[PDB]
Amino acid sequence: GIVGVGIDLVSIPDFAEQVDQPGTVFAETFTPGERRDASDKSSSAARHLAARWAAKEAVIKAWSGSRFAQRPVLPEDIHRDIEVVTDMWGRPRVRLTGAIAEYLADVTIHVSLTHEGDTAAAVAILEAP
Questions:
Q1: Contact, 121 vs 115, CB < 8 A?
Q2: With CB atoms 3.0 to 4.6 Å apart as the test, which of 15, 21, 62, 103 could cross-link to 6 if both were Cys?
Q3: Which positions make up the binding site?
Q4: How far is CA 5 from CA 61, 62, 81, 87, 129, in A?
């Protein structure tokens, strides 16, 4: 049964404006080079990266909306234990580490991402067999 659902829309312009700032959570998900390239509103990098961020936030949203919210704890490591990459063709892939990988070890994560104009989007659905 479904155990969590998330959706997230990202402004590509607003994304590129803050994606490259130090200490932010962007630094723990994208490489400096990636953040540098994504700083260009009009680049493909910004578009693709914006879409990866939406994916990640969507999963995070699904997590916070599940039974794994209320614990355990440390809402700083979940933002860091979650990662989303794209494989050649353009399909999103969710990569887990830290505690979240353990707690969602038996949970299937379904994610999809898109982007158009000044916005990127994604949806995530947590499902247990």
A1: yes
A2: 62
A3: 8, 52, 114-115
A4: 7, 4, 18, 23, 15
Residue where the block lists tokens 């990098």: 45
CA distance 53 to 70: 23
Residues 6+ apart with CB under 8 A from 56: 29, 82, 83, 84
Q: Return d(Cα 103, Cα 111) in angstroms, integer.
A: 18
Binding site for Mg(2+), by residue number, is: 8, 115
Query: CA–CA separation, 115 vs 121, rounded Å?
Result: 6
32 by Cβ neighbours in 10 Å (0-12 / 13-18 / 19+) ranks as exposed
Which technique was the structure solved with, according to the deposited record? X-ray
Rounded distance between C-alpha atoms, residue 122 and residue 129, angstroms: 23
Binding site members for CoA: 52, 114-115
**Two tokens, residue 96:** 């887990």
Resolution to one decimal, Å: 1.9
Kindly write down the DSSP assignment for every residue of 84-95, as one continuous string. EEEETTTEEEEE
